[PDB]
Write a protein that binds this ligand. Structure first.
Ligand SMILES: [Mg+2]
Ligand SMILES: [Mg+2]
Ligand SMILES: [Mg+2]
Ligand SMILES: [Mg+2]
Ligand SMILES: [Mg+2]
Ligand SMILES: [Mg+2]
Ligand SMILES: [Mg+2]
Ligand SMILES: [Mg+2]
Ligand SMILES: [Mg+2]
Ligand SMILES: [Mg+2]
Ligand SMILES: [Mg+2]
Ligand SMILES: [Mg+2]
Ligand SMILES: [Mg+2]
Ligand SMILES: [Mg+2]
Ligand SMILES: [Mg+2]
Ligand SMILES: [Mg+2]
Ligand SMILES: [Mg+2]
Lengths: 135, 149, 61, 141, 65, 214, 100
RNA sequence: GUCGGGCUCAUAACCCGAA
RNA sequence: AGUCCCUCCCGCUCGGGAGGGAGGCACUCUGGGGGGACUGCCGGCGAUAAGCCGGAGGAAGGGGCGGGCGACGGUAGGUCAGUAUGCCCCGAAACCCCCGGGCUACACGCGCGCUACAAUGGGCGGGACAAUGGGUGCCGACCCCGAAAGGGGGAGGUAAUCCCCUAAACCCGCCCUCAGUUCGGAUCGCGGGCUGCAACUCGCCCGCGUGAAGCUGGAAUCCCUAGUACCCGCGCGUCAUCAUCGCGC
């Protein structure tokens, strides 16, 4: 009974995924992945499964728990977790080489974070400033 | 099949239609005349909005119980247009929510946990999950990917 | 006492309400019931404007 | 059956509009109050105004004559606790205008601060007047 | 009517009032002077291996310092 | 309204938005070919990772470039067809989901109206809207003069995309037409060289001014 | 039959020293001692305008005070409780002992 | 010609709007 | 998360879910210590120096990214109305308290913003996903009453334990269809509340009614190079009550 765990992060969202042999069921916080909305979020999660192919997809079950961030941050973190779990579970280098070509961030992640805000119109952002007048 | 397996809005619609058969669910006498909160502008446009609100509250108790009036008031609030001032968030009122919870308890679907709020009874869980099963059966005729679940 | 509320027993009397520098006379009528006394003793003088001075416009400075 | 113009309480109403929005052409009746009166009359707020009958128009005029006695709550009328009689009243058109004029005149007769603000045409609800509320032409130096 | 394509082979330098122009050497690929190398002034980012569509091939830019 | 089969759509192949393949799409102009990216890809959303590196935008799929182009207000500090179009609190700045849906609906309308693959029609439009000659400014005696120059292919592509977006923006401003319909109309008109297209007319005007200043 | 020890300080080194001494005492005897658990640091940030007057560009100071914390569990045995009760922490350290 | 606003450290010249 | 027990649901149970308890520190997280990047490796330009340009590998590549720390001086720049201080003045008032006013006035010129002029929308019902901070002169779950604002009781919390705290922009369905309108919400009438010793001058909130200018802006002119700008809400300061502001998320 194999159980494999993986982790993914994207701008304060954190996702933990578990994978084992199954029938093709993928749930996100208890919901089937086929019913995630909006469509742009749904396609974000589904890309690694489509890349892997129908044979591999239908032979496993994946459960993902994700918290923090927003609806686009959570989709990308789950995508990273699923891709890492798929490369570790099947252990073949053609699929891993396929992920790096299509999207490197799938396996290496994204380190970007918000820049802290500064005085002169602090609430708007680090660089935006008040309009300047001379008379 | 459970509540977790179907889209929320479609389930609320089906449950609202099925709730009209329970004699213990009846709109109050002031229902024709009120708004649902200080952040709204106009009255509800559906003549049968009471049943939709009751069904939404029941599904909310199912998913997040035990839960009380104040937190539900947070959930049903929203953004308000304030004329020349910027928009802001505000809570909803309490009379609608409290009356809906009392009616649901009268029907036996929810019950009171002391100092903690209200929770779904086995009868209410069966009532919701049966309708969810029926909706999922119809749903997977046109989305074959939902048969595996 | 500018914050005193006018009551029905005060109707018919005359009361001198301070406005900052002088006591001004107020005669209580029945339709005054429920209003503060200060509402009938203005504290500011009506404005009658004169000619704008030097610096009142960009080209006058 | 269909009429393009229907007169209700002495106002010509559009016949192609929904009843709830058509009723707002009356001064004294906004959308919320109009929906309330449509619901009390037992009429669909979304039906076209041009399908009304004579008995329905009579019933609407009766409701507008005395809404409180027909089941509309006392907190929904535009003149609760009338200054003269003390009842909860609702007014439309000329009566509404004359009641407002009487209120302002009563303020002016006792020489209250608000009445003086009304007379001089200046803001009455505590606003600052140095910067905004300018209506005129520039003075020269 | 459809211009003549030319391939950039060397970058010379920046010019223009605000530095917005680049001078290059190009080789004509089609037409009467196919094979001729001429220098031209270009607006926009450009690198070795790009292809321009000249509407005529008889004007040559003045050599810059 | 929208059928449930379209609300919950599950694709199984790698193609643009799970609905259109670009295998038969051809690019006729030899200068624009290495800069119009058509490599197979399902979701056109790269999260702005290309702008940091020089010439990075070359390897960005053309549909995502179009989506990025429409995610804007339109008329901030210059006039389009005689007007500023300042939309502010009701613009599409930073709302990528709505722009994505606009592009999707425009593609469906295009395919229904012409019977061809929408990507091909878009390619034809950008080919017809890309200028070949422009001008640079000089100053003498307090008078401004034009001098004709050539245009690099990346700038040609950027200008064509910008003008297509601006034409669509102008066609839906304070009129009964919707944004998706206006975009489909602008693309179709530019594909056929109709002077009713904003981008094609702009393209002709730029070339005329460049020609008369050699 | 277990005692809970809470520690707090503005200095990391002293806090570490006290925890290590308690750990040595718990090692010197047959007794299990749950390791020192680090609780989140408390941060006190105050932002102030720099100039005494109001002329010139506005500029600000961001002053910070940091208070570190630890938690230690041990089983209340008198042979071990006497040694820990006779330890003296530096004056810049708060120590609180309770029995649960 | 009158009044108001731009440009300038400021004034003159210059630009814009209005009656 | 995997594992054991108990209870309740579903297509009646081969299978799929949800609570509670035993149990564990795996995973997330918290915070002490350590590793990692050096123009180190490769190819060019320059001199064979200083360096520069382009590649690999890499979480990260050329002050890696964002901040704190501002030399000798000048500016008779600002501040004696934060506190310290020389001289000159008042010293039965220019010192000390109490009451009522004023700083909130209004033909008009200007700065910085907010809300709009609508479909790249307005309304009505339904569905989603945060982080920073703060709490005993206080934060208050949970129950009851009220149409709303609010009112009556009150668990837990001196806090990784309890609370503020189920954000909005976004998505689904229906009405409106280019109109000064179902756009906009200034202005005003009547009524209901809260804080406070006091609400007229001169506070904030809620219900019904009322419905001004505005249909994209001359000459000019501002901010910004990446998780940046735009768009969206939220926390803290001030604070009895009061945020179109400041500092942050
Ligand atoms: Mg930011
Ligand atoms: Mg909502
Ligand atoms: Mg608005
Ligand atoms: Mg706003
Ligand atoms: Mg001058
Ligand atoms: Mg640095
Ligand atoms: Mg000086
Ligand atoms: Mg000065
Ligand atoms: Mg002042
Ligand atoms: Mg409106
Ligand atoms: Mg809504
Ligand atoms: Mg109107
Ligand atoms: Mg009043
Ligand atoms: Mg007042
Ligand atoms: Mg007008
Ligand atoms: Mg218009
Ligand atoms: Mg201030």
């Amino acid at each position: 009974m194999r159980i494999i765990q993986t982790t993914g992060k994207r701008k304060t969202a954190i996702a933990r995924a578990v994978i084992r042999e199954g029938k093709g069921r993928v749930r996100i916080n208890g919901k089937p992945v086929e019913l995630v909305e909006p469509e742009i979020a749904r396609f974000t999660i589904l890309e690694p499964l489509i890349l892997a192919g129908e044979e591999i997809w239908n032979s496993v079950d994946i459960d993902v728990k994700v918290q923090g961030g927003g609806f686009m941050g959570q989709a990308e973190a789950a995508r990273i977790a699923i891709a890492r779990a798929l490369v570790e579970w099947t252990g073949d280098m053609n699929l891993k080489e396929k992920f790096i070509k299509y999207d490197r961030t799938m396996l290496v992640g994204d380190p970007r974070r918000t820049e802290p805000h500064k005085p002169n119109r602090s609430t708007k952002g680090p660089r935006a400033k008040r309009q300047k007048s001379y008379r | 099949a459970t509540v977790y397996d179907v889209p929320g809005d479609l389930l609320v619609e089906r449950v609202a239609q099925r709730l009209k058969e329970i004699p213990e669910i009846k709109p109050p006498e002031w229902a024709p005349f009120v708004k649902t909160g200080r952040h709204k502008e106009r009255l509800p446009e559906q003549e049968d909005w009471w049943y939709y609100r009751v069904a939404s509250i029941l599904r909310r108790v199912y998913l997040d119980g035990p839960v009380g009036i104040e937190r539900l008031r947070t959930y049903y609030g929203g953004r308000k247009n304030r004329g020349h001032a910027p928009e802001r968030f505000y809570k909803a009122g309490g009379s609608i929510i409290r009356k809906a919870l009392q009616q649901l308890e009268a029907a036996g679907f929810v019950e009171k946990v002391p100092g903690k709020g209200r929770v779904i009874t086995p009868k209410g869980r069966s009532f919701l999950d049966k309708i969810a099963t029926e909706l999922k059966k119809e749903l997977e005729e046109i989305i074959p990917e939902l048969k595996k679940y | 006492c500018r914050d005193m509320i006018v009551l029905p027993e005060m109707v018919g009397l005359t009361i001198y309400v301070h406005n900052g520098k002088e006591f001004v006379p107020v005669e209580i009528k029945p339709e005054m019931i429920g209003h503060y006394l200060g509402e009938f003793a203005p504290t500011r003088k009506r404005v009658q404007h004169g000619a704008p001075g030097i610096g009142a416009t960009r080209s006058s400075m | 059956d269909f009429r393009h113009i229907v007169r209700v309480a002495g106002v010509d109403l559009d016949g192609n509009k929904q009843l709830r929005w058509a009723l707002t052409a009356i001064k004294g009746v906004g959308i919320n109050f109009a929906t309330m009166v449509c619901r009390v009359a037992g009429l669909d707020p979304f039906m076209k105004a041009g399908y009304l009958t004579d008995e329905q128009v009579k019933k609407i005029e009766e409701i507008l004559q005395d809404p409180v006695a027909h089941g509309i709550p006392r907190w929904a009328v535009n003149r609760p606790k009338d200054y003269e009689t003390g009842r909860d009243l609702h007014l439309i058109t000329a009566k509404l205008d004359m009641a407002i004029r009487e209120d302002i005149m009563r303020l002016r007769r006792i020489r209250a601060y608000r009445g003086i603000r009304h007379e001089l045409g200046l803001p009455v609800r505590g606003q600052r007047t140095r910067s905004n509320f300018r209506r005129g032409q520039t003075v020269g130096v | 009517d459809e211009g003549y394509p030319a391939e950039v082979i060397e970058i010379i330098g920046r010019t223009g009032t605000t530095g917005d122009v680049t001078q290059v050497k190009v080789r004509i690929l089609e037409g009467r002077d196919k094979g001729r190398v001429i220098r031209r002034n270009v607006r926009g980012p450009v690198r070795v291996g790009d292809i321009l569509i000249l509407r005529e091939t008889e004007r040559e830019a003045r050599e810059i310092k | 309204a929208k059928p449930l089969s379209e609300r919950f759509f599950i694709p199984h192949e790698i193609k643009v938005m799970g609905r259109w393949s670009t295998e038969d799409v051809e690019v006729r102009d030899p200068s624009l070919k290495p800069y119009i990216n058509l490599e197979p890809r399902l979701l056109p959303h790269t999260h702005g990772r290309h702008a940091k590196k020089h010439f990075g935008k070359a390897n960005v799929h053309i549909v995502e470039r179009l989506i990025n182009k429409i995610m804007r207000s339109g008329g901030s500090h210059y006039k389009v067809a005689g007007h500023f179009m300042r939309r502010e609190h009701r613009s599409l700045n930073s709302k990528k989901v709505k722009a994505y849906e606009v592009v999707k609906e425009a593609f469906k309308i295009i395919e229904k109206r012409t019977g061809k693959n929408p990507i091909q029609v878009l390619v034809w439009a950008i080919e017809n809207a890309a200028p070949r000659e422009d001008t640079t400014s000089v100053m003498f005696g307090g008078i401004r003069y034009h001098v004709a120059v050539d245009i690099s292919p990346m700038r040609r592509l950027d200008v064509a995309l910008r003008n297509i977006a601006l034409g669509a923006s102008a066609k839906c401003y304070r009129t009964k037409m919707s944004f998706a319909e206006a975009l489909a109309e602008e693309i179709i008109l530019a594909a056929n060289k109709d002077p009713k297209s904003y981008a094609y007319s702009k393209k002709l005007e730029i070339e005329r001014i460049a020609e008369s200043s050699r | 039959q277990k005692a809970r020890i809470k520690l707090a300080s503005t200095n990391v080194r002293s806090l570490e020293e006290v925890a290590n001494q308690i750990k040595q005492i718990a090692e010197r005897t047959g007794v299990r001692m749950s390791g020192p658990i680090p609780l989140p640091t408390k941060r006190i940030r105050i932002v102030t305008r720099k100039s005494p007057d109001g002329e010139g560009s506005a500029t600000f100071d961001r002053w910070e005070l940091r208070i570190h914390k630890r938690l230690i569990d041990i089983e209340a045995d008198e042979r071990a409780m006497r040694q820990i009760m006779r330890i003296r922490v530096p004056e810049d350290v708060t120590i609180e002992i309770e029995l649960i």
